[PDB]
Design a protein around this ligand. Structure first.
Ligand SMILES: CCCCCCCCCCCCCCCCCC(=O)OC[C@H](COP(=O)([O-])OCC(O)COP(=O)([O-])OC[C@@H](COC(=O)CCCCCCCCCCCCCCCCC)OC(=O)CCCCCCCCCCCCCCCCC)OC(=O)CCCCCCCCCCCCCCCCC
Ligand SMILES: CCCCCCCCCCCCCCCCCC(=O)OC[C@H](COP(=O)(O)OCCN)OC(=O)CCCCCCCCCCCCCCCCC
Ligand SMILES: CCCCCCCCCCCCCCCCCC(=O)OC[C@H](COP(=O)(O)OCCN)OC(=O)CCCCCCCCCCCCCCCCC
Ligand SMILES: CCCCCCCCCCCCO[C@@H]1O[C@H](CO)[C@@H](O[C@H]2O[C@H](CO)[C@@H](O)[C@H](O)[C@H]2O)[C@H](O)[C@H]1O
Ligand SMILES: CCCCCCCCCCCCO[C@@H]1O[C@H](CO)[C@@H](O[C@H]2O[C@H](CO)[C@@H](O)[C@H](O)[C@H]2O)[C@H](O)[C@H]1O
Ligand SMILES: CCCCCCCCCCCCO[C@@H]1O[C@H](CO)[C@@H](O[C@H]2O[C@H](CO)[C@@H](O)[C@H](O)[C@H]2O)[C@H](O)[C@H]1O
Lengths: 57, 459
């Protein structure tokens, strides 16, 4: 009763059902290091201006 | 100060936009009216200095210098007017511009409230001054005098720039009031000794200190008249003004680091005074006279006593007016015989009796005749130097004797004896030449009646 698969059928991507648990850390990776904390606030003008030597503004 | 500065910035458009026949009248009229406005600084009814903004501020040290600068601009215009009459119009306006630019920078230099701002202005003055000496000087040696003037200053000034940056990288600021009220004693380590020389050699070269003074007799002997007037009257006092301002942050290293420089000044001044006895060039005799007066100013600042500062401030203003008067007088002969040799023209009192009176009064100011403020300086510097140590009176006694000889020898040689009768081109003194001398001498006499105005910070 065997039917030969047509052209293209063996190269299809099928879905397989299994009761094996899904691995969650397949790469055995560590914890990613924390990001540098962000700085909160709205911009205000620079205090006393550029503060460049004797320039006032 | 922006009411002394902005109107002065307007003498530049006024120089260029004025008519060819009005440039010299217009600019010299408004220069006087600018030196009148600078008298507002003298309205000091309290013990607090005038702070006008974050940039500028006037003290009892920076006010006499500021005013002397503003008053000198109209004087230099009249001095430069007869030896520029043959130049086309743009050259005159370009000469007037370089003199104004030197007055604007000099006023900003004395009114600056921060050391870095002082330094930049204190370096910018080389440009108009190098242009003046070189472009409008007379002899071939003016090219070598511009180099000597430019690179004595710059070599000394690079370490000062380094030291000023170190001060700010450590203290956080260069404001002169803050550095005064937060000054910390320095350790006597070998690094601070170099910080001291770094902060001082720039100003000690500009005085000039003995040894490193060969730029001054070169610059003077070849600059046009207004080049010598500003040099001898203001630019030398940039050194003195700087040392007073920055020596507050250098304690206690001045108690020992100063010995080499008190000794070069005290001994150096005798070497320079004795040179004036054998100096064959009249413009050169005065230039060494300046070196020997600034020696006392260096010596008195290095000992930091209320009297020594007071004497040096008076001698700074007194020398400013006196040396300028001498250079103008020597120029008056030079613009007749085109020779600087002192012995070439003799017996000039016979044909210039009035100009021979100004010679006598300038010469008497130079040898510090009481009660002129020239003596008050010399006298209060001697008093302080005596307290510092008692044997300095030996060297100051000598220098006072030599100072009489070359002052009168200057007068006896050129104004007395027989007339050099072959000089048929001795024209009568111009009204312009005589006004120039009256403008030097009248303030000097007035300041003697009111010495309070030039006692400086300590008194
Ligand atoms: C400025 C407005 C005033 C008008 C001046 C005027 O018209 O003078 C005309 C008057 C006569 O005209 P002239 O015939 O052409 O005279 C000029 C001659 O060529 C020659 O003129 P001269 O030599 O005959 O007169 C000039 C006289 C110098 O001028 C003087 O007349 C002496 C007046 C004292 C200064 O020469 C000196 O004698 C030097 C005197 C040195 C003083 C020594 C003592 C100083 C210490 C004492 C003072 C301190 C006291 C404090 C109290 C404590 O000449 C002068 O007075 C000289 C003009 C320049 C003024 C000199 C400084 C005074 C101002
Ligand atoms: C020609 C012969 C004369 C030569 C003059 C040489 C000038 C040298 C200038 C050196 C730099 C000093 C001026 C820069 C400065 O610090 O000015 C700062 C200025 C501040 O503004 P201001 O109104 O002047 O005062 C504070 C209130 N805002 O704000 C500014 O930055 C103005 C900048 C333009 C300066 C003019
Ligand atoms: C007559 C002369 C006269 O008027 O004398 C009076 C007055 C001196 O009186 P006073 O010192 O105030 O009294 C204090 C206690 N006796 O004398 C005076 O106050 C006159 C002071 C003259 C001030 C100079 C006027 C400006 C001239 C241009 C300045 C050029 C010199 C540059 C140096 C400036 C330094 C201040
Ligand atoms: C910080 C202060 C500001 C500093 C400003 C620097 C100013 C420039 C200094 C360099 C000198 C400028 O150079 C100067 O150029 C002018 C015209 O441009 C020349 O002027 C002269 O010669 C040229 C032709 O030879 C004519 O067009 C001119 O009318 C005549 O007066 C001067 O002979 C020269 O000395
Ligand atoms: C303590 C700090 C002080 C340090 C001061 C150092 C300042 C340095 C000044 C640089 C001087 C450069 O000096 C330069 O060379 C010599 C110096 O004699 C001058 O030249 C002059 O003398 C030389 C002799 O050697 C001749 O060849 C030349 O014809 C003549 O003009 C140059 O015209 C000048 O441009
Ligand atoms: C011929 C030109 C002469 C050059 C003159 C220049 C002025 C001299 C400046 C003083 C010498 C250097 O002064 C130097 O200052 C620095 C910081 O500024 C300090 O030096 C030290 O700084 C910090 C600590 O402060 C250390 O981490 C560092 O390792 C070290 O360099 C010392 O104070 C002195 O070593």
């Amino acid at each position: 009763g065997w039917v030969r698969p047509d052209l293209g059928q063996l190269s299809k991507v099928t879905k397989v059902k299994t009761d094996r648990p899904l691995p969650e850390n397949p790469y055995h990776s560590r914890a990613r290091p924390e990001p540098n904390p962000v700085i909160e606030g709205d911009l205000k003008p620079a205090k006393h201006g550029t503060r460049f030597f004797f320039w006032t503004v | 100060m922006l009411k002394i500065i902005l109107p002065s910035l307007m003498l530049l458009p006024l120089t260029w936009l004025s008519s060819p026949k009005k440039t010299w009248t217009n600019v010299t009229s408004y220069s006087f009216l600018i030196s009148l406005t600078s008298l507002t600084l003298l309205w000091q009814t309290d013990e607090n200095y005038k702070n006008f903004s974050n940039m500028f501020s006037s003290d009892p040290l920076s006010t006499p210098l500021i005013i002397l600068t503003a008053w000198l601009l109209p004087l230099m215009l009249m001095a430069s007017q007869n030896h520029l009459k043959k130049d086309n119009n743009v050259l005159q306006k370009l000469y007037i511009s370089m003199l104004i630019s030197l007055q604007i920078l000099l006023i900003m230099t004395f009114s600056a409230t921060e050391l870095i701002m002082f330094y930049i202005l204190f370096e910018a003055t080389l440009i108009p001054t190098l242009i003046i000496i070189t472009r409008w000087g007379n002899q071939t040696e003016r090219l070598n005098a511009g180099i000597y003037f430019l690179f004595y200053t710059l070599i000394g000034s690079i370490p000062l720039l380094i030291a000023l940056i170190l001060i700010q990288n450590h203290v956080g600021t260069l404001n002169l009031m803050i550095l005064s009220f937060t000054t910390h004693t320095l350790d006597a380590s070998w690094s601070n000794n170099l910080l001291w020389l770094a902060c001082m050699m720039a100003f000690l070269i500009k005085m000039p200190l003995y040894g490193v003074h060969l730029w001054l007799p070169k610059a003077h002997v070849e600059a046009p008249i207004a080049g010598s007037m500003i040099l001898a009257a203001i630019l030398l006092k940039l050194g003195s003004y700087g040392m007073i301002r920055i020596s507050i942050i250098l304690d206690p290293l001045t108690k020992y680091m100063a010995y080499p420089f008190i000794l070069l000044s005290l001994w150096g001044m005798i070497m320079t005074s004795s040179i004036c006895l054998r100096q064959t060039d009249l413009k050169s005799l005065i230039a060494y006279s300046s070196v020997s007066h600034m020696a006392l100013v260096i010596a008195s600042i290095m000992i930091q006593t209320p009297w020594s500062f007071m004497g040096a401030t008076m001698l700074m203003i007194a020398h400013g007016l006196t040396s300028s008067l001498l250079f103008c007088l020597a120029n008056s002969n030079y613009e007749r015989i085109h020779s600087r040799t002192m012995i070439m023209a003799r017996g000039l009192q016979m044909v210039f009796p009035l100009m021979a009176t100004w010679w006598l009064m300038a010469s008497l100011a130079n040898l510090a005749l009481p009660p002129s403020i020239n003596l008050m300086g010399e006298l209060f510097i001697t008093m302080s130097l005596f307290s510092w140590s008692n044997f300095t009176i030996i060297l100051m006694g000598i220098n006072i004797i030599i100072t009489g000889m070359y002052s009168m020898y200057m007068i006896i040689t050129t104004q007395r004896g027989k007339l050099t009768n072959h000089m048929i081109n001795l024209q009568p003194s111009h009204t312009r030449e005589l006004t120039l001398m009256a403008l030097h001498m009248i303030p000097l006499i007035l300041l003697t009646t009111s010495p309070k105005l030039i006692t400086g910070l300590t008194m």
